[PDB]
Write a protein that binds this ligand. Structure first.
Ligand SMILES: */C=C/C1=C(C)C(=O)N/C1=C\C1=NC(=C\c2[nH]c(/C=C3/NC(=O)C(C=C)=C3C)c(C)c2CCC(=O)O)/C(CCC(=O)O)=C1C
Ligand SMILES: */C=C/C1=C(C)C(=O)N/C1=C\C1=NC(=C\c2[nH]c(/C=C3/NC(=O)C(C=C)=C3C)c(C)c2CCC(=O)O)/C(CCC(=O)O)=C1C
Lengths: 479, 470
């Protein structure tokens, strides 16, 4: 059924019946028999791959056939890209085997191929820069700027995805002309499950011309299975109408994205946008897929090194709490210490200490809410750690360290705030599509707002780790 | 100037006019004027080089000269390459630029391949190994295996260079007919200073054939400076006769290495040895060059991640020490404690604690020695911190934490512990190990700056406690 805003969350974009027109596609079954092909084989390649047929050396050349032959029956690895000029143009021919189907893709090459030396040199510079700077925010920033020098794209941004899958533009190099989307936030809904899986499975993804018209592949179904063809790993797999509308609203008509994958999760991706159709040669894209690997590798460690630091200041800051509580025998004093205090342990907008009936509220008037939270927990006598990002103050983390005299510690966070807003000279809409204003950056951001309304920043894994240890410390102190 | 074992430490391996015969070299000055070339240029290539000669289009083709042209007009260290025709035993023309000399190196592109020569394909495969592992040891162990699978070398090893630059075989996958070299410690003098400057500035080295026949370049002197050509960044640079003699004693005749550089140190390298002559294509070597950098990067933050962990357990067990010491007023109880004690604070074979006339030693008898040390610390009575590796036992790290009652804490470490050529057994693994034994005799594994940082921190902790006792 036709994709609407109402059902786009479930659009199966891995089994579209089409490909992008700047290439051709022939899908083969495990024994070499053609199962399907795209409308334009004869026009682009000058021959008709008929279902039931087997390709000949005559049709598609020795280079392609030899790859096709070692590629089909595929124990062990094999070169899966080949050059050949079947016609008058130049074709990179790319083959891969997913499920049990073999996809043979013909993509026209335009620009000079990858200069492997001048790519190695560029790889040095980037690794050398992040050698100096162990900010993962600096890596993103540098590689972003660098991607634009290399590719020549009009804009390249770096997205970081939070735990709730929402996105944030944490870097950007555009040409002076264009408006900046720096600091943009967008909801999980802007990158649906299927699209997200595809960003994890595929490092690089390219959209040559957004204002194109899809070239269908027939037959639509796989006669061997009576189900659609899975084009997850296809270089030419067509784009969604929804997205294409979104992109044209922005005035963008060529996209090129490099994934950053850590764990199973998609940690973020570099998005390259062009204002006119743009095509990047397969082997070049393959060099960028290397960046995808390197960044993912580096970013992973930079991140685990950061939580490592958080954990170090935590323990050191707990050590001070012991150096301090055991001397004068007053928790409150130690806990309320400005720099090393609990309000500084876990990032928050305020804290509250309870022991006996004594209440020390730090950075605001938190007794009332701490009182109300406690009344709730009264109906839940066995809970020792409470935390919610719903509820003055909607984020709450409570740990009980002494039950008899009801000793608790509370951290509070206010609603989540958009870090950086742009203002002044406002809003050149460019055309709006039929689907509505939802498919514009402003529409997306407003969609994010509605999502986070009433929610604080989520209690990190580490924030919870530190609090659980702090609770253990407080328990033994009271003993 | 013959290479003798005694002289070889100064051997200038970076200048010798010889190259390896599997390729051809042509050296030009800034303006494209030929200054020198190997005596096999016309053997492999169409024509003959000659000083004063500005490169002939007819012999080198359009791409190459056209490449050199854009290179010439660039004032930075030029590095580029193209694959092109020359009589149709076609080549990879790979050029660089050191000083103001332009070098063109010619490698034969071999049609018959049973493996994948795609630069992007190979690069993606090894680099994938980096993303997988957390151990810096696991990584080395696994990339070692993957390298042997990818290249098919008879043996591939991974070295780690300690503080004294003595290396250690930490990982190894071999053909099961070959003896194991795992653990082998060899002296720093098996890799001279010059060899190291090169391994550091060059991610990849390739010796195609060990019993090679040095293909001389003429002229030998650089006409302009009248001083030797520096082939530091050359691929086809000839190989030291001493090293070659070393490899032949081992029955090795083909060799490739991947450097690992963190900071400016040859942290370690992957060495591939083959028992028969072997050759890797240029683009595949570039596959390993970019891996060298990526691996270096990841290894660095894997290491600094490791010390960060060390420091966390330090602050952690240091915290427990403080708790234990404040709970019951007596220090010794927490210092002597098994897992959270000082003996487990810093890698050591033993520990000792002095406070007043009361001395407590952990895991050994260090009282006699603690005394001697303490006695040398009579001089410089202001010395709060001390450490060394020479001296009974040789690893001594001492900190003072209480002046009035001579409160000291010590950590102690023990000492670390048939077809040969004309130079003798010195150039065999057996010789190397022995040589290393000589070097390490009176030295214990050095105290890392992390060990010292921990001791230094501990010391501060203790003083604070003693002041608080009052
Ligand atoms: C009904 C589902 C979708 C809605 C709603 C929507 O807006 N897009 C939907 C589907 C897809 N989005 C895909 C990629 C994609 N979309 C965005 C969204 C943005 N939100 C913003 O605020 C901004 C810019 C300010 C953007 C661009 C992004 C960031 C991406 C990733 C690629 C890119 O950055 O261009 C997508 C995949 C298409 C494909 O196959 O490439 C689908 C489907
Ligand atoms: C007189 C100086 C040298 C001595 C002594 C020596 O053994 N080699 C000397 C000069 C050079 N060594 C070079 C490289 C090199 N040598 C070793 C030595 C080993 N010691 C061992 O115990 C084992 C094995 C158990 C070995 C292999 C190594 C490891 C290396 C690095 C390269 C490799 O691993 O093969 C060297 C550089 C030669 C070049 O140009 O590649 C010089 C010069």
């Amino acid at each position: 059924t036709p994709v609407t805003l109402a059902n786009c969350e479930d659009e199966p974009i891995h089994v579209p019946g089409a490909i992008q027109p700047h290439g051709a596609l022939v899908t083969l079954r495990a024994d070499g028999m053609v199962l399907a092909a795209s409308e334009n084989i004869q026009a682009l390649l000058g021959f008709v791959a008929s279902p039931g047929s087997y390709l000949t050396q005559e049709q598609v050349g020795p280079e392609v056939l030899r790859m096709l032959e070692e590629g089909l029956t595929g124990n062990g690895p094999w070169s899966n890209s080949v050059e050949t000029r079947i016609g008058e143009h130049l074709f990179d021919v790319i083959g891969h085997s997913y499920k049990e189907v073999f996809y043979l893709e013909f993509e026209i090459r335009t620009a000079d191929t990858l200069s492997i030396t001048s790519f190695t040199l560029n790889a040095q510079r980037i690794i050398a820069q992040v050698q100096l700077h162990n900010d993962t925010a600096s890596l993103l920033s540098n590689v972003t700027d660098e991607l634009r020098r290399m590719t020549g794209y009009d804009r390249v941004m770096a997205y970081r995805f939070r735990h709730d899958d929402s996105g944030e533009v944490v870097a950007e190099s555009r040409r002076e002309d264009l408006e900046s989307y720096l600091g943009q936030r967008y909801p999980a809904s802007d990158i649906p499950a299927q699209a997200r899986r595809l960003y994890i499975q595929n490092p690089i993804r390219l959209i040559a011309d957004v204002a194109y018209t899809p070239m269908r592949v027939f037959p639509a179904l796989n006669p061997e299975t009576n189900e659609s063809f899975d084009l997850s790993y296809s270089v030419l797999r067509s784009v969604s109408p929804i997205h294409c509308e979104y992109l044209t609203n922005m005035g963008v008509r060529a996209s090129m994205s490099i994934s950053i994958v850590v764990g199973g999760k998609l940690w973020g991706l570099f998005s390259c946008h062009h204002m006119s159709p743009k095509l990047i040669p397969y082997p070049v894209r393959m060099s960028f897929q290397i960046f995808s690997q390197v960044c993912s590798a580096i970013v992973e460690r930079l991140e685990q090194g950061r939580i490592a630091e958080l954990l170090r200041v935590s323990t050191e800051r707990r050590l001070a709490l012991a150096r301090r509580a055991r001397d004068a025998d007053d928790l409150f004093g130690a806990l309320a210490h400005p720099d090393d205090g609990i309000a500084a342990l876990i990032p928050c907008d305020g804290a509250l200490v309870m022991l006996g009936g004594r209440t020390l509220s730090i950075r605001g008037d938190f007794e009332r809410q701490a009182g109300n939270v406690l009344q709730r927990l009264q109906r839940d006598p066995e809970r020792d750690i409470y935390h919610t990002d719903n509820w003055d103050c909607c984020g709450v983390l409570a740990i009980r360290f002494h039950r008899q005299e009801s000793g608790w510690i509370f951290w509070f966070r206010h609603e989540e705030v958009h870090r950086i807003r742009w203002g002044g000279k406002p809003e050149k809409l460019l055309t709006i599509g039929p689907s509505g204003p939802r498919l514009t950056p402003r529409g997306s951001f407003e969609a994010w707002e509605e999502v986070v309304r009433g929610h604080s920043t989520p209690w990190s894994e580490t924030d919870l780790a530190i609090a659980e240890k702090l609770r253990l410390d407080l328990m033994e102190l009271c003993l």
